Amino acid sequence: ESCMVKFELSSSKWHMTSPKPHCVNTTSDGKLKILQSGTYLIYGQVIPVDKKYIKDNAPFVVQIYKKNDVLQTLMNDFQILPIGGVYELHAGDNIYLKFNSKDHIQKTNTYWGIILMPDLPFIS
Amino acid sequence: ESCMVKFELSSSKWHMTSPKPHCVNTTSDGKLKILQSGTYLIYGQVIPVDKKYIKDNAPFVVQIYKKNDVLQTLMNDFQILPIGGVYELHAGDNIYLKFNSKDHIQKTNTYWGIILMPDLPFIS
Amino acid sequence: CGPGKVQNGSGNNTRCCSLERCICVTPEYHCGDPQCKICKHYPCQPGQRVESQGDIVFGFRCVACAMGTFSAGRDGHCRLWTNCSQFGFLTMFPGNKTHNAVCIPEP
Amino acid sequence: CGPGKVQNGSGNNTRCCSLRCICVTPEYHCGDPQCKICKHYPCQPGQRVESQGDIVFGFRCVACAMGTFSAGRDGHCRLWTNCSQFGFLTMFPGNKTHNAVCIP
Ligand SMILES: *[C@@H]1O[C@H](CO)[C@@H](O[C@@H]2O[C@H](CO)[C@@H](O)[C@H](O)[C@H]2NC(C)=O)[C@H](O)[C@H]1NC(C)=O
Ligand SMILES: *[C@@H]1O[C@H](CO)[C@@H](O)[C@H](O)[C@H]1NC(C)=O
Ligand SMILES: *[C@@H]1O[C@H](CO)[C@@H](O)[C@H](O)[C@H]1NC(C)=O
Ligand SMILES: *[C@@H]1O[C@H](CO)[C@@H](O)[C@H](O)[C@H]1NC(C)=O
């Protein structure tokens, strides 16, 4: 059915559509583990801190990892960036986020999640 | 009872769950006209051409519009660009994309679309 | 700020719109948006205009000034040559891109 | 590069990996923690190159720690040469800018 497993960063709580979703067995730290294989949609916006607030001159980078190999590698000059995309996956896949410095992110208004893909056999 | 569409650049055709989705009345331009009010999720990747195939000094910028009002404004140094985020709108709002130069855009592996968000009431 | 214009913006974002296209008048500043919502800073050299490619946000390059015109400043605007012959005088120096033509004073 | 260490990359991407790859081209440093690529961030004498970041490095050109030195732009804190354990005494002890000299 419908498994959208959103994760707010402020509350560190996985807002879910179902008690124990069919497609995901989530974790509290923001990581997750794929249950059912198929097509998915990683989504979410990542709000960075203002350029004034940053300490280190480390660049703004947001990556997405499937298991241990890299899936997505995004970077902009400290502006609002959305993440994700359509990706077909197998079962038991780790989907998490690694960014170079956890110090330069806005915990408020930052979210990420994954959705199962209903089949798309119609075209117009 | 799901409502999901996706426009591809290569096919220039929308791939849908249903022939006439209740939530939208798509334009083959690539724009879309929502019909159902509620929570949506704009998604999709925008893959540009290599920085050697470029022509003008115009920077890579991708915008998203609500009617005629701007909704999103993204930019990177000509690499993969995921777009969108969670947004709640109402019946009859114009959603489309404006670029800086359409010659920046590589048609292969570039897509976007919106899905009606099944509400997530649970938490974890 | 201009006869057929009205003043818009302050400081370096100053611009005088007409008709609705505008021109940043602070030197070496140019419209960054098609509606010139903000003025940006991109100086050039003599004999060079400032082309601005883009449909939402402009990119810049110091393209040279077209033939028949000139530009003796870093602002990057092709001001037109003075054709004294059609205007009333003769010309001592014909002029090039870096400098303006000169006209002879005695006649 | 070295007999008991691993050569990877060529030209400016040259580095010596172990079984902590270290870019050997001067004033070139690892850009990623895995040192997949070597980047260019020169320093001045008496300075090393700190690299904060967990996926892509940013570079601060911090001064040399006490007990070390660096007399070049490469930005690497090489350890002082203790002439005493090598065979000589030390004429000038050495500082951040300069390494000690040995008296034969
Ligand atoms: C054309 O470019 C030349 C570049 O040297 C300049 O030539 C002018 O003409 C006199 C001739 O005696 C030169 O000695 C000077 O360098 C220039 N005169 C002045 C007053 O600057 C000049 O930049 C350009 N000339 C014109 C007429 O545009
Ligand atoms: C759907 O969009 C098309 C675009 O050509 C338009 O002609 C049509 O009227 C729209 N449908 C409705 C119900 O407005
Ligand atoms: C332009 O004006 C702003 C004031 O809005 C000022 O801070 C700045 O120094 C000026 N010069 C620039 C941006 O080169
Ligand atoms: C370091 O020692 C050398 C050797 O005498 C000397 O010339 C140089 O000035 C010293 N620099 C500092 C900062 O002490």
Residue numbers in the entry:
A (entry chain A), B (entry chain B): 50 to 173
C (entry chain D): 29 to 47, 58 to 145
D (entry chain C): 29 to 47, 59 to 143
Q: What wording appears in the published article?
A:
Glucocorticoid-induced tumor necrosis factor receptor-related protein (GITR) and GITR ligand (GITRL) are members of the tumor necrosis superfamily that play a role in immune cell signaling, activation, and survival. Upon binding to its ligand, GITRL, GITR produces costimulatory signals regulating T-cell proliferation and effector functions. Here we present structures of human and mouse GITR receptors bound to their cognate ligands.
We expressed mouse GITRL and determined the 3.2 Å structure of the dimeric mGITR–mGITRL complex to compare with the human complex. There is a cavity of negative potential from hGITRL D149 and E155 that positively charged K105 is positioned near. mGITR does not have a buried phenylalanine, but rather an isoleucine, and the glycines are conserved. mGITRL has basic charges (K147 and K153), while mGITR has a negative charge (D93), but this electrostatic interaction does not appear as favorable as hGITR. In contrast, the loop rearrangements that occur upon GITR binding GITRL do not result in any allosteric affects at the dimer interface and the apo mGITRL dimer and receptor-bound mGITRL dimer are effectively superimposable.
